[PDB]
Design a protein around this ligand. Structure first.
Ligand SMILES: CC(C)c1ccc2oc3nc(N)c(C(=O)O)cc3c(=O)c2c1
Ligand SMILES: CC(C)c1ccc2oc3nc(N)c(C(=O)O)cc3c(=O)c2c1
Lengths: 98, 98
């Protein structure tokens, strides 16, 4: 249950786990991310990527599909895809040259 | 349209796009990934992350859900979740510390 660096492509997915899981372990489950801390991370360390830092209720409901307490990686996975999808095409209509 | 470096967390998921997009551009849709080249990426530059390199069809069928011979980021999204999930708890039975 510990992410170690190996190759350039394997290190990218490892950097996202090793950087925020140090604070996510504070609440229940080691592999699960907190419901109150992920909202603060998207408005402090990840604000430029996801334009809707305040309007996160659309994804917040889609993430916790089982509805327990926190966002497990299987539940948080809905934002992991939007992380690399909104990086190049957050507004593919007005701005298309980054 | 293209992916450019940003913050520590945003740059990790951003680098994964720019590394494989250099070879994915040759096939249809720049944002979409090929069904043969992505399989070769796991058996050359990502073999240690995904322990099951031979039987890739188990995830391949879950990726191309639309059935159009093109793995868009919405289709490839299922492997992005399994990439970061099969790094710390790949074999949660025999080994649980790396
Ligand atoms: C990848 C990094 C953020 C990470 C992820 C999961 C972790 O799960 C652990 N389990 C433990 N019981 C103890 C401990 O017993 O101190 C500590 C940790 C980690 O340091 C630990 C570190
Ligand atoms: C830095 C270089 C290797 C690179 C990396 C990712 C890229 O992602 C893009 N996205 C797009 N939709 C289109 C496009 O709409 O034409 C083109 C590209 C790139 O040229 C492109 C170029």
């Amino acid at each position: 249950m510990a992410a170690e660096p190996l190759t350039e492509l394997e290190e990218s997915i490892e950097t996202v786990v090793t950087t925020f899981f140090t604070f996510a372990r504070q609440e229940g489950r080691k592999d699960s991310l907190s419901v109150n801390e992920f909202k603060e991370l998207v408005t402090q360390q990840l604000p430029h990527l996801l334009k809707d830092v305040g309007s996160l209720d659309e994804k917040m409901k889609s993430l916790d599909v089982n509805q327990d307490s926190e966002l497990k990686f299987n539940e948080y996975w809905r934002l992991i895809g939007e992380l690399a999808k909104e990086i190049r095409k957050k507004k593919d209509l007005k701005i298309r040259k980054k």
